[PDB]
């Protein structure tokens, strides 16, 4: 940090002092090998570690004229490395200085709002295309719907939006299509009904009719946007009722390639460790749950200390994450299993547990209640060899998912 | 038993547990056993207006990751387990300062 | 005193096995002749061994599979024959490997063999039965990577 | 947009010439009215460009298109094509063209030397290489007697 500090001081010191200097041509002339420089830096970079990047980006604002730092890159690399906040400053104030598959420069706007969704700040994300960048009527109304949290009008508002052909005054953007894609896949997220929800995700990715998986991993934009909606939805169909195992065979794929792999233990612990309890690999399942607590605090120690929005949608999902744990300690015990004693004890401790209810929005109370649910019938067939009431407390807990 | 009497009282004795346990783990183990040994043990009721102070000082253990009977592996797994297991309406309080403005110190020119 | 078996081979199978039982420690096969008429040796078949599989746990017994052309190396397949109906064929994934390149390997009676091989597989991990969980799914579209 | 119909007038006329600068005002038009173009009219207006500079000569300007559209860098780069397969199957050929036949005459950077040296240790790149370019690194090497 202090050396990060000091290269900021002392760059800025050279560079104001440079101004003494005062020779006009060649500043506009040494900046540009400056500033290829610093985009080559992220271009390039895989460790991406975060008081560098820092430093990086503490140069562009302290002086000017290298605010026209490429934004994808430093983007993707405050996504991948955190430190949001800079990256935030810096493509705001780059944002202030006029100009004498997207041409315009506009893709500032659509980095700021990738990088805004990454930190969890949602409500200026309304605020910037409320900010009426990407002018059609239609969709101003699509966002008063959801931001009355009516995500069933704006889910045929926005479906209207798009196999709308006879356009007139004007056509909108390609950018506005990725946004309306982004904006109903988290609507149909708040709605459950996945089934469309997969459709949707299948279908913008590849064409073929029985739904296609696997050419997924063709481009980054696919998986850096799509892949997780892909991978919740199905599992959520698959663990109510039964349903082709096409996520399974698809998995059965994403091991062997390495640098999925990665990418899995990086982002899908729980995800991959449910999907298994279906196939009862317990001892894998075990490990993919310890493995999961470690990303959530390896995620949870990067993450800044003043941001608390980030820091309570990460600190939310480990109250499922030791669901799992507690769920897999049941299972593979004998003296539970042929007795009847504990499953009364685990009932009462699940019956004086809920999230706030208040405080935690639904696309966390969904998750829990059906993982609840899943676990139930899932431990309904080991008992067989009073079990009833079982099957109620569904009911009861599904009231509470009412209220 | 003893911790159903009163709790303000030995709420700070904990709290400089868990403070220092983090240069001396075996005060750390102690104290996060006492942990659930209360929440299972002590009516829901009696206990939820204390946790607004007994959790926020938890959060330092949360720190630091870079990969003698007592290790730090073992009780930062066994912490985050039990900041999950004791429930998302209690460990919503472990914030720094629980729903406060309070805390700008330190971040001034 | 290999001869003293080998030329002996195919004569009361219900004891023709005791050699083995010490030999198997002692003269693990090589230098051509000689380890053709090992292979004719092992050609007897015989339930004495059951864990011997541990042996071919060990791996290179893939590119020895074709050291020498045409007939001598038969046996070294016919031992995957001969003890197909127990396995589990988590290692004749890479076993078959350079089966996909015997295609590549000149042989005929040997690829009659691999043809026959091939046949059995596909009938025999029951390929209708459609088993979700199954690791089969590789071993599947591998053994048709060949097979057409 | 009625200017692109113009544009094809004074192309199909042989007038290169003009047309070059009919295309360039129609790509460096940013107050577009009575509603915009496609994408797709963007990349066919790359091509036409690229084919009347192509009947022009004067392939500086050839030049300075082809690494533009591809990459950013001010010191034009030539590394970072292979990056997609439009990329190679459009825009490769005219920038070798240009490259190759800037460095014949006279003499200048030699980048595309140094490019086709990374370009023969890429395996699938010399299959494309082998398939359609003999002239090229021929000729190319005929400037340093690899005889």
Known sequence: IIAKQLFSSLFSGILKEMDKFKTLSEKNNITQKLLQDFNRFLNTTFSFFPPFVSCIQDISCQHAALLSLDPAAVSAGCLASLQQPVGIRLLEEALLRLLPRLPPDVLRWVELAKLYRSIGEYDVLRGIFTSEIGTKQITQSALLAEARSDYSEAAKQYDEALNKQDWVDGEPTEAEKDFWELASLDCYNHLAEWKSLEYCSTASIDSENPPDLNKIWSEPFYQETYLPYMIRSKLKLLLQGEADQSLLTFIDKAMHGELQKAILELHYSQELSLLYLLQDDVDRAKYYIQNGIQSFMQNYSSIDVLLHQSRLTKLQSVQALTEIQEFISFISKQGNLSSQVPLKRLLNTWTNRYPDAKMDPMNIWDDIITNRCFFLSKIEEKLTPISSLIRSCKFSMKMKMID | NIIELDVRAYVPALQMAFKLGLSYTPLAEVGLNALEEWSIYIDRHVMQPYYKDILPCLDGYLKTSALEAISLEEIRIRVVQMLGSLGGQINKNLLTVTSSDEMMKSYVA | ?148
């Open chain 3, 1 to 148: 005193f290999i001869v003293c078996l080998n030329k002996v081979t195919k004569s009361f199978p219900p004891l023709a096995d005791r050699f083995m039982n010490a030999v198997f420690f002692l003269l693990p096969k090589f230098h051509g002749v000689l380890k053709t008429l090992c292979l004719e040796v092992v050609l007897c078949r015989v339930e004495g061994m059951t864990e011997l599989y541990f042996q071919l746990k060990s791996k290179d017994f893939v590119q020895v599979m074709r050291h020498r052309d045409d007939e001598r190396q038969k046996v070294c397949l016919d031992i995957i024959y001969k003890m197909m109906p127990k396995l589990k064929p988590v290692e004749l994934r890479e076993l078959l490997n350079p089966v996909v390149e015997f295609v590549s390997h000149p042989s005929t009676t040997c690829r009659e063999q691999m043809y026959n091989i091939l046949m059995w597989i596909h009938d025999n991990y029951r390929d209708p039965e459609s088993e979700t969980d199954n690791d089969s799914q590789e071993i599947f579209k591998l053994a048709k990577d060949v097979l057409i």
